[PDB]
Design a protein around this motif. Structure first.
Motif, short mmCIF file in Angstrom:
data_model
loop_
_atom_site.label_atom_id
_atom_site.label_comp_id
_atom_site.label_asym_id
_atom_site.label_seq_id
_atom_site.Cartn_x
_atom_site.Cartn_y
_atom_site.Cartn_z
N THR A 101 -0.09 10.85 -2.66
CA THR A 101 0.40 12.15 -2.23
C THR A 101 1.89 12.31 -2.52
N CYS A 102 2.65 11.22 -2.44
CA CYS A 102 4.10 11.27 -2.64
C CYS A 102 4.50 11.33 -4.11
N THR A 106 0.82 -1.20 0.00
CA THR A 106 0.00 0.00 0.00
C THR A 106 0.86 1.26 0.00
N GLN A 107 2.03 1.21 0.64
CA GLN A 107 2.90 2.38 0.73
C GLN A 107 3.63 2.67 -0.57
N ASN A 125 1.40 5.38 -2.83
CA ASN A 125 0.92 6.52 -2.06
C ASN A 125 0.82 7.72 -3.00
N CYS A 175 7.90 13.44 1.77
CA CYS A 175 7.73 12.00 1.65
C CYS A 175 8.70 11.40 0.63
C1 LIG Z 1 1.18 8.35 2.48
O1 LIG Z 1 2.29 9.12 2.94
C2 LIG Z 1 1.98 10.04 3.99
C3 LIG Z 1 3.24 10.82 4.28
O2 LIG Z 1 3.25 12.07 3.61
C4 LIG Z 1 1.45 9.29 5.20
O3 LIG Z 1 1.08 10.22 6.21
C5 LIG Z 1 0.26 8.43 4.81
O4 LIG Z 1 -0.18 7.65 5.91
C6 LIG Z 1 0.63 7.52 3.64
N1 LIG Z 1 -0.53 6.74 3.22
C7 LIG Z 1 -0.81 5.50 3.63
C8 LIG Z 1 0.16 4.88 4.60
O5 LIG Z 1 -1.81 4.90 3.24
#
Ligand SMILES: *[C@@H]1O[C@H](CO)[C@@H](O)[C@H](O)[C@H]1NC(C)=O
Ligand SMILES: *[C@@H]1O[C@H](CO)[C@@H](O)[C@H](O)[C@H]1NC(C)=O
Ligand SMILES: *[C@@H]1O[C@H](CO)[C@@H](O)[C@H](O)[C@H]1NC(C)=O
Ligand SMILES: *[C@@H]1O[C@H](CO)[C@@H](O)[C@H](O)[C@H]1NC(C)=O
Ligand SMILES: *[C@@H]1O[C@H](CO)[C@@H](O)[C@H](O)[C@H]1NC(C)=O
Ligand SMILES: *[C@@H]1O[C@H](CO)[C@@H](O)[C@H](O)[C@H]1NC(C)=O
Ligand SMILES: *[C@@H]1O[C@H](CO)[C@@H](O)[C@H](O)[C@H]1NC(C)=O
Ligand SMILES: *[C@@H]1O[C@H](CO)[C@@H](O)[C@H](O)[C@H]1NC(C)=O
Ligand SMILES: *[C@@H]1O[C@H](CO)[C@@H](O)[C@H](O)[C@H]1NC(C)=O
Ligand SMILES: *[C@@H]1O[C@H](CO)[C@@H](O)[C@H](O)[C@H]1NC(C)=O
Ligand SMILES: *[C@@H]1O[C@H](CO)[C@@H](O)[C@H](O)[C@H]1NC(C)=O
Lengths: 223, 341, 210
Positions: B255-256, B249-250, B253, B259
């Motif tokens: 948003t990144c 899952t990471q 991500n 990060c």
């Molecule tokens: C994606 O990355 C952010 C860090 O900027 C984190 O806070 C977030 O939990 C992450 N998403 C996940 C783990 O699903």
């Protein structure tokens, strides 16, 4: 060879959930994608999603991912479709179909399940009240006419025969109609010779299994 | 002069007959020695059609790996038909080696040397070879490991992108190392993979811009798989004979992606697995003692595109896989068999 | 999205005739176009896959052709088993379909009107029914007149499937009125307009009369 059989029709209130199952046989279950489609009354086939039985990978059409879960049992060779938060517009016939392509995907569906009717309504089960349609004046057209009025019942279906099934010629049972009240209604009519209205007695046998309501109504002219 | 044809191939490898490693044992009896110094002939003024998704070479390799895994990775318990099959399940030495696929007499392989050939279409730069390159039969899902790389830009492969049921192979042009470890010193099945977040998020960003190229600049979104077995909802692979399941899952991500440190993915060694070869679960013994470690090159990604009706300006993708034939497709795309006449 | 349009939507057909129906696409589709037959209450049936490959077991009289954005389903020597709707398909996009119905000569509708039964009038509601029995074509108008006041939005219509033997249709129109409302008006008529008639037909009755 391939043959898919689905579960029986469902009666659900709004907000409830439903599970439609699809038993397969006659082919390698994991080598064929299984698609799920639905057809609302009057509309065309709408795609719900598919599932690759090998590992259960799934995909969905517009908006179905949020409320539909597609699983399978590779050993029993049966596929499942769980729909949650049922809305009235979910009322449709849900179909289970297989891809003819061994392994790959072609979307040509050569095996289909008979379909599963799912109705979503807030109307509680209720039996019909039957009223007669007394034959009129001696009508032309070569014959007269009479029938029965099966009003206010839920859910479908209701069986109507005439004279315990002896009168089959010229019988017209109209498809049911949904009223704004959420209840169904229909009528069964039959044209009978104008001269047989005095002697022969005509009877419509109404049967509504969901409410265990049987009614034998005698249709007779009113003097 | 020649025509597309399907025939039985034979394999070649540099397997060592003295090795206990199961791939070397299989290739010792199955394959012949590698050609000391082969030589491909460039076909001048020849445009040939390739279809990586309808390539019979993929089928034959699938038979080999199934054979290799059934001769050397036999479990303690197995579900054959309806009966339970008990049998020995000793630990093995497991490390894939490259296998070359060669044509018999009267045939030859044509090789597409177009730098950015997508696998389905014409190829203007063609050559003939006696054998393919050394392909490692690496069995994995979601991520393609230890494969070859695209020689220039990242390449999106798919028999048809409109068909949401068609797997998408993202062929990378720069490996991203994945470092998975079950430490020596509680729960003997806990593991983890470390990935360079800065490097990965940059590669993943270059993947989105390449997907925009194929989807009218629509916004690209990555999501985790919606359902299915643990072998596809997680990154599944074999390491030193142990079966790893890693939460990815990471690695997706959103948003990144425009990060950036070390991504530690939770992993688990499972003894009970759903076999990719066919049907049934398999049960193996617990993991070996000591530090189990595997460093692999992420050289490709397997994606399944959401069927969101395309009415929205977005386009969601989820890590796919499962059909291991796709793994062999990502390596045999540039090849095809023809018959000499 | 690949919008699928099929024409003609409805089609009058006769046994033994050659039939051909068209399916058009929003975009170039190549050849992976699939044809299906669907009858009410049953499951669809695959006729032809990939334009021209007829599925095993399908009668040889079925055929397929076309390319790119236009595809045809052709049947030579039509038979009583070929009467149904027909969908064309690409990927998840099914076409609305094209329904076949046997063609017969014009048939005027026998009209009947039924007043509410005194048993129903005790239920507070009154159902007036107008029956249009045996006719062709399917289309027809039904106007509800109550003391020459045209009724709209308070009637529901239902039509039977094409009869398998005489090939005609039949229709019902149910005017639902309140008990008190029904009593206040006297004359109740339903005017029928159909191709097989020279002028409209106004079957009627009068409240409290015989
Ligand atoms: C994606 O990355 C952010 C860090 O900027 C984190 O806070 C977030 O939990 C992450 N998403 C996940 C783990 O699903
Ligand atoms: C064509 O393929 C050959 C390999 O056979 C390669 O050396 C060459 O760079 C490619 N491009 C051209 C323009 O020849
Ligand atoms: C991984 O990629 C590196 C290049 O960064 C290369 O040196 C190495 O041999 C590759 N290993 C495998 C197993 O593909
Ligand atoms: C990989 O391909 C991308 C375009 O998809 C390009 O921007 C990048 O420079 C390439 N990387 C290498 C090392 O060639
Ligand atoms: C691959 O390239 C060929 C030639 O341009 C094209 O016809 C085909 O659509 C492409 N397919 C993909 C998946 O990019
Ligand atoms: C992989 O990670 C372990 C600890 O998690 C570390 O000791 C090892 O050096 C790493 N390997 C590489 C090649 O970075
Ligand atoms: C992670 O990747 C970045 C960008 O490629 C690089 O600068 C950095 O050194 C890497 N981290 C390592 C090698 O530990
Ligand atoms: C991966 O981890 C996230 C957060 O810890 C979790 O929500 C998700 O369910 C995990 N994936 C699987 C397949 O268990
Ligand atoms: C990839 O190759 C490296 C080096 O040969 C090896 O250590 C690793 O185990 C391989 N990965 C897999 C998944 O086989
Ligand atoms: C296809 O069917 C239609 C039916 O409307 C017909 O008009 C047409 O001639 C047929 N053939 C072609 C090529 O369109
Ligand atoms: C993919 O298939 C669809 C539907 O058949 C078609 O419209 C589209 O042109 C195809 N794309 C390619 C690249 O062949």
């Amino acid at each position: 060879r391939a043959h898919l059989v689905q579960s029986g029709t469902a009666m659900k209130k709004p907000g409830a959930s439903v599970r439609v199952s699809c038993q397969t046989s006659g082919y390698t279950f994991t080598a064929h994608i299984l698609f799920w489609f639905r057809q609302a009354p009057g509309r065309g086939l709408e795609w719900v999603g598919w599932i690759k039985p090998q590992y259960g990978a799934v995909n969905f059409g517009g908006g179905f991912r949020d409320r539909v879960t597609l699983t399978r049992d590779v050993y029993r060779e049966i596929a499942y479709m769980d729909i949650r938060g049922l809305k009235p517009d979910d009322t449709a016939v849900y179909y289970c179909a297989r891809d003819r392509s061994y392994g790959d995907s072609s979307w040509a569906l050569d095996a289909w399940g008979q379909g599963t009717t799912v109705v979503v309504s807030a109307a509680s089960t209720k039996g019909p009240s039957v009223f007669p349609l007394a034959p009129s004046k001696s009508t032309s057209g070569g014959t007269a006419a009479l029938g029965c009025l099966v009003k206010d019942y839920f859910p479908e279906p209701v069986t109507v025969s005439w004279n315990s099934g002896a009168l089959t010629s010229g019988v017209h049972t109209f498809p049911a109609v949904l009223q704004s009240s959420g209840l169904y209604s229909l009528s069964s009519v039959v044209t009978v010779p104008s001269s047989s209205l005095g002697t022969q007695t005509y009877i419509c046998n109404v049967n509504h299994k969901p409410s265990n309501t049987k009614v034998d109504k005698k249709v007779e002219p009113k003097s | 002069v020649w025509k597309d044809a399907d025939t039985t191939l034979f394999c070649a490898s540099d397997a060592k007959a003295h090795e206990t490693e199961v791939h070397n044992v299989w290739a010792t009896h199955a394959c012949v020695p590698t050609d000391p110094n082969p030589q491909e002939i460039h076909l001048e003024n020849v445009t040939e059609n390739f279809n990586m998704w309808k390539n019979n070479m993929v089928e034959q390799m699938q038979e080999d790996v199934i054979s290799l895994w059934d001769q050397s990775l036999q479990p303690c318990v197995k579900l054959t038909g309806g009966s339970v099959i008990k049998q020995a399940c000793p630990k093995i030495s497991f490390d894939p080696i490259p296998i070359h696929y060669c044509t018999p007499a009267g045939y030859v392989i044509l090789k597409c040397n177009d730098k950015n050939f997508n696998g389905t279409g014409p190829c203007k730069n063609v050559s003939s070879v006696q054998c393919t390159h050394g392909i490692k039969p690496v069995v994995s899902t979601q991520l393609l490991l230890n494969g070859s790389l695209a020689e220039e830009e990242i390449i999106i492969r798919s028999e048809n992108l409109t068909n949401n049921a068609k797997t998408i192979i993202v062929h990378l042009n720069k490996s991203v190392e994945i470092n998975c470890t079950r430490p020596s010193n509680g729960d003997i099945r806990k593991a983890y993979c470390e990935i360079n977040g800065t490097k990965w998020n940059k590669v993943l960003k270059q993947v989105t811009e390449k997907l925009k190229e194929h989807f009218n600049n629509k916004t690209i979104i990555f999501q985790p798989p919606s359902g299915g077995d643990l072998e596809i909802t997680m990154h599944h692979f074999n390491c030193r004979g142990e079966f790893f399941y890693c939460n990815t899952t990471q690695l997706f991500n959103n948003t990144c992606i425009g990060c950036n440190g070390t991504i530690t993915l939770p992993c688990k060694i499972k003894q009970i697995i759903n076999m990719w070869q066919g049907t049934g679960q398999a049960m193996y013994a617990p993991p070996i003692d000591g530090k189990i470690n595997c460093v692999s090159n992420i050289t490709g990604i397997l994606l399944t595109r959401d069927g969101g009706a395309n009415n929205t300006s977005n386009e969601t993708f989820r890590p796919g896989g499962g059909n291991i034939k796709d793994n062999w497709r990502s390596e045999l795309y540039k090849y095809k068999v023809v018959q000499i006449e | 999205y690949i919008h699928v349009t099929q024409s003609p939507s409805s089609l009058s057909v006769s046994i033994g005739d050659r039939v051909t129906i068209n399916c058009q696409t929003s975009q170039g589709v190549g050849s992976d176009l699939h044809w299906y037959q669907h009858k009410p209450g049953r499951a669809p049936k695959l006729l032809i896959h990939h334009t021209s490959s007829v599925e095993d077991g399908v009668p040889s009289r079925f055929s397929g052709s076309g390319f790119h954005t236009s595809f045809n389903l052709t049947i030579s020597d039509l038979q009583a088993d070929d009467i149904a709707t027909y969908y064309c398909q690409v990927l998840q996009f099914f076409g609305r379909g094209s329904r076949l119905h046997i063609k017969r000569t014009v048939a005027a509708p026998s009209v009947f009107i039924f007043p509410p039964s005194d048993e129903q009038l005790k239920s507070g509601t009154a159902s007036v029914v107008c029956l249009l029995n045996n006719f062709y074509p399917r289309e027809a108008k039904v106007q509800w007149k109550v003391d020459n006041a045209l009724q709209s939005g308070n009637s529901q219509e239902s039509v039977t499937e094409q009869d398998s033997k005489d090939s005609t249709y039949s229709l019902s129109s149910t005017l639902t009125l309140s008990k008190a409302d029904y009593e206040k008006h006297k004359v109740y008529a339903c005017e029928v307009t159909h191709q097989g008639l020279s002028s409209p037909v106004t079957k009627s009755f009068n409240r409290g009369e015989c």
